[PDB]
Protein: prostaglandin H2 SYNTHASE-1
Organism: Ovis aries
Amino acid sequence: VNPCCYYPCQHQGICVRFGLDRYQCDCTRTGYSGPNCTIPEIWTWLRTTLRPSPSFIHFLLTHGRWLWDFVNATFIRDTLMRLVLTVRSNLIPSPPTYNIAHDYISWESFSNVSYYTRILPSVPRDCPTPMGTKGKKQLPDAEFLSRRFLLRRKFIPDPQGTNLMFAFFAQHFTHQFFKTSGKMGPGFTKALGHGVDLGHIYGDNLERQYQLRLFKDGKLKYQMLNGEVYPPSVEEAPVLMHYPRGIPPQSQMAVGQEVFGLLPGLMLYATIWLREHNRVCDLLKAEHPTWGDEQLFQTARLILIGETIKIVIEEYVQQLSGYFLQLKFDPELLFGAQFQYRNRIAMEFNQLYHWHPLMPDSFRVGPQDYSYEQFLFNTSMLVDYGVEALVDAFSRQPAGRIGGGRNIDHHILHVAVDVIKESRVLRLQPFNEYRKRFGMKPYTSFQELTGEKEMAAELEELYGDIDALEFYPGLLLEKCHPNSIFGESMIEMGAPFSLKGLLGNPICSPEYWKASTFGGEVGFNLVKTATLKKLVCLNTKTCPYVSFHVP
Amino acid sequence: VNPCCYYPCQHQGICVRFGLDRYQCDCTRTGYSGPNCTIPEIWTWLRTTLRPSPSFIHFLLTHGRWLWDFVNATFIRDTLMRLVLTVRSNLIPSPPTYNIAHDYISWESFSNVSYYTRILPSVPRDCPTPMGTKGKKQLPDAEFLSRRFLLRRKFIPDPQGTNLMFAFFAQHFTHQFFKTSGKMGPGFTKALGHGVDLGHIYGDNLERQYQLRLFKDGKLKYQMLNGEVYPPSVEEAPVLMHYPRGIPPQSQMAVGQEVFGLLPGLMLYATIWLREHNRVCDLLKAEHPTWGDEQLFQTARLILIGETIKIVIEEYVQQLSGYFLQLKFDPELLFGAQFQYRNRIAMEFNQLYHWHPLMPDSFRVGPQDYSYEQFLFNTSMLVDYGVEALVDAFSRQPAGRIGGGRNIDHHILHVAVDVIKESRVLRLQPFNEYRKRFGMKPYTSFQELTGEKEMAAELEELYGDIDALEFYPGLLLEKCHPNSIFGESMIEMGAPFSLKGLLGNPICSPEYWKASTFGGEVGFNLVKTATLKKLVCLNTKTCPYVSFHVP
Ligand code: HEM
Ligand code: HEM
Ligand SMILES: CCCCCCCCO[C@@H]1O[C@H](CO)[C@@H](O)[C@H](O)[C@H]1O
Ligand SMILES: CCCCCCCCO[C@@H]1O[C@H](CO)[C@@H](O)[C@H](O)[C@H]1O
Ligand SMILES: CCCCCCCCO[C@@H]1O[C@H](CO)[C@@H](O)[C@H](O)[C@H]1O
Ligand SMILES: C[C@H](C(=O)O)c1ccc(-c2ccccc2)c(F)c1
Ligand SMILES: C[C@H](C(=O)O)c1ccc(-c2ccccc2)c(F)c1
């Protein structure tokens, strides 16, 4: 049997097949040596035994407000943010390594941007079991697994107070770098760009971008409805949008991300961001009357990218982490560090981000309560209520807890079923292997994974061995931190991907992070002081309750 | 008038148009301050006043063999190589900045790989003169300029002893990353990859690659002639090649770079490298009997990329530079430094690499002397003589001196004429501006540029002002270093572009530079010990005189 099926190499060592039945582990720079990269070097040992557990650190970060309030007002804040940024980032290979086609470094994997990368190589196709060596010959039925442990019975709100304003932002934001190609199959993406390029606003290709642009003042095409600004119709912006057959072009809104017409929440943000882009163009023109359409457009896009990163780190991730430490977006924090300003979306990151539990049982907008059937392909709700109204409603309605299990609404449970199926097609390694790859000890049992006994027992019977537990199911069923939105794994694995994706952007490099890049001091400050509240309120007639936290 | 036409901002400061007639310079991180970034900071001043001139350093590097021999044997070698690598590299912006369409940072310039980047923004289209502010309203006729100062009269051999083996390597090597698109126009390239990706061997696109591959043992297709291995014919490898109409497919060789069938010298290297690829596949299969075609192919490609970089730095640049310092290819030399492992080909780099003066009056192969008309599209010479014979001939024939002027054979003078024309289309800034951008003082007169009076006087009459002298003409007409192949500019401007292109390759990154990346210790050593002699001789029946230096 293939010796690499036993995942012999530890601590990022690379398993290579040699001869007919042998294997060797390349422990280069792993900090370890030995046949399996398990014998540590002195420093590797100190470091690993002095490192407190993720749970302990989480505790420190979510307690002692008074002490943190002091720390947040000093340079210690920066010192810690830089620490967070570098330690989380180093866990992500850069340049990227493997893809669905190559379980080894190759020029094709490096240059071929249509591929999602992957942190761990796949489970060799010739292993005795689907997960490698452990588990049963056949994995649990995806549907059953989903109905049994992910289906929502009673809506469980997020203890951290996360609202739908956050949920939809999450969806909107991620769908700019998660666009799995149906034509090329899993493992492939149309979101070339691999990060925060705002392609869900400008399009993932030039032609579409040009069709969305006004080519006047660097602005984006738009239309007026009830005296408000909204994305233009597909009639005025002949772009491909995924709308149900039967919906005429003049009733479709053209935005950048083909799938956004499928949710008011999504089109809401599409509208907000579009309004903001045109707004920045105005400010820019005031500063540079000699500039043409291109430069105004390009420069505005850069400002919005900056705004997006700012809001995501300081407000989105802040809300999501619940830390008392004040997260900070300051590219300069890495100017003295070794860091590659590039990023490549990993398939695991795609899986991990399927936060469908966040969606509610229904959508409350004022006195009205809308059902999934009234909400999903609604082409009028956004215009009927307008931006302010929806922002207020979404900011007030709690979102469901992500981890813990049994919390995905039946209307969208099919997505989880497909994520599990894709996982197997992608031949993703077992959850415990990913635990190790991200610095955690593997779970020794299901009862340790879940903080209980009922589900644990059933999972053990189904999977047969904790070492067979799959990636996504593991993330969603892992016991949550005290009163947190999800378990440690989601953070320990999710943070590295996110932070590398945010800071890995070229505008965060010494070369780009200059006032001139954003049209001058005025443009630079729009980035440096971006805010969710300002994003909405500087573009709406009135200012509603806007936040990622429920009131 | 546009204030940026005066190139007011110094030391890489960025000129930005403000209001109707104003401008501001963004001096961020330039080491200077002031309206024009001319007021040096304390360290900036020390460094600039303690830095000896390029000529002085050149002198040190080309004298005192005894001392250098001692140094080359110590760690000082590594120390100096690190220095050269980082100081030269820091002069190249990474991520890249501008392109033919944008004279400012933009997401499109960053993501759009079909564009060549540029170090200096173009001469604003609305400047009083073509070069900005200096010179005449009309630039000198390209043809005349070429016939007057670049046309070869009497063949001037390279004093450093460079041969045609080197000359053909240079052409072969560069055409993998210099592939200007005719359909898209100047400023656009088909060599996505922007570096040493060996696309001239494997193709610049998958389809072409696939057509060139055997899909067995990871090898490339090939054919046998006179018992020797050669690239296959277009009949077996249906791939687009630029051969003159009238030549049958059976006489066309398929290699990777469409234009290589136009010179025995080029096809020679195409054959050598192809033989080497298949050779490495053999060694790999011996090591990994379980490997499939893909991995064998991919891994062999990585090894060849490494071999190419090793040889280019330790033998190619060594010969070219004339330095007594033993250059060294070692990715680890940068592991402690801040360095972006990415590269983007600059249009200026393309211009500067037009080394046509290297070509001779005719091509001597043994007793026979071949004219340009007998050499250029010869489809039989390579097979008639075979690899060993041509390598020996090309290694023995001296190549022409690059700098100095009046040394380009009339047969190819038209290329220079076009380079000058493209320069104007690309609106490249004046030579002196590039001098500054690369750390040199601008020439105060033509007589200072050339080391003489006659041509100087005529150039002054034609251009009117030293500040109007164009990029390429400046590189070729600048007085050469003592007994060197070219002037300081060629080195001070080209070295940064070159070294960055070599070390800024993903295989030189901590993540890729591992034995596992190249199939193990055996594959790694092929890179670490690559040599021009071995490249040829481990793939030929007999071993001829092989070198970049004439005997
Ligand atoms: C109205 C509620 C939602 C619905 C109806 C919905 C529906 C879907 C559907 C149909 C798919 C593709 C399924 C397939 O191809 O089998 C999908 C993918 C996805 N969804 Fe949702 N979703 C919702 C909310 C969310 C939220 C709140 C997030 C959190 C950021 C999210 C994140 C994702 C991700 C990351 C993907 C995969 C992206 C890709 O591979 O292209 N979804 N969703
Ligand atoms: C048999 C001798 C040679 C001939 C006939 C030749 C011919 C040409 C021609 C016809 C072009 C394109 C001209 C145009 O589009 O107007 C060209 C481009 C070029 N040549 Fe040569 N060349 C020769 C030797 C060399 C050598 C020794 C080098 C040194 C590395 C070199 C470097 C280049 C470069 C860098 C380009 C531009 C690449 C691009 O933009 O695609 N050439 N040459
Ligand atoms: C003073 C420093 C002492 C360092 C000793 C560290 C002991 C690490 O011990 C290692 O543990 C691994 C996992 O159990 C084993 O696989 C290795 O073979 C073993 O050497
Ligand atoms: C109170 C000081 C807080 C400093 C923030 C540390 C940054 C978080 O660091 C994280 O710690 C985890 C647990 O050890 C590791 O598993 C992660 O890989 C690491 O990135
Ligand atoms: C005697 C030791 C020599 C070490 C080689 C130094 C590396 C070359 O360094 C170069 O020197 C030039 C001259 O000032 C500068 O103009 C270039 O910008 C710089 O990169
Ligand atoms: C700052 C903090 C950390 O590094 O611990 C952090 C950073 C990013 C995330 C995060 C995890 C998953 C998706 C999106 C964001 C997270 F949950 C926590
Ligand atoms: C090592 C040395 C240096 O940095 O001075 C060096 C490095 C690269 C070049 C070089 C210049 C133009 C084309 C190709 C190579 C060169 F001419 C000299």
The pocket of flurbiprofen (ligand 6) is lined by residues A 84, 88, 317, 320-321, 327, 490-491, 494-495, 498-499 (CB under 6 Å).
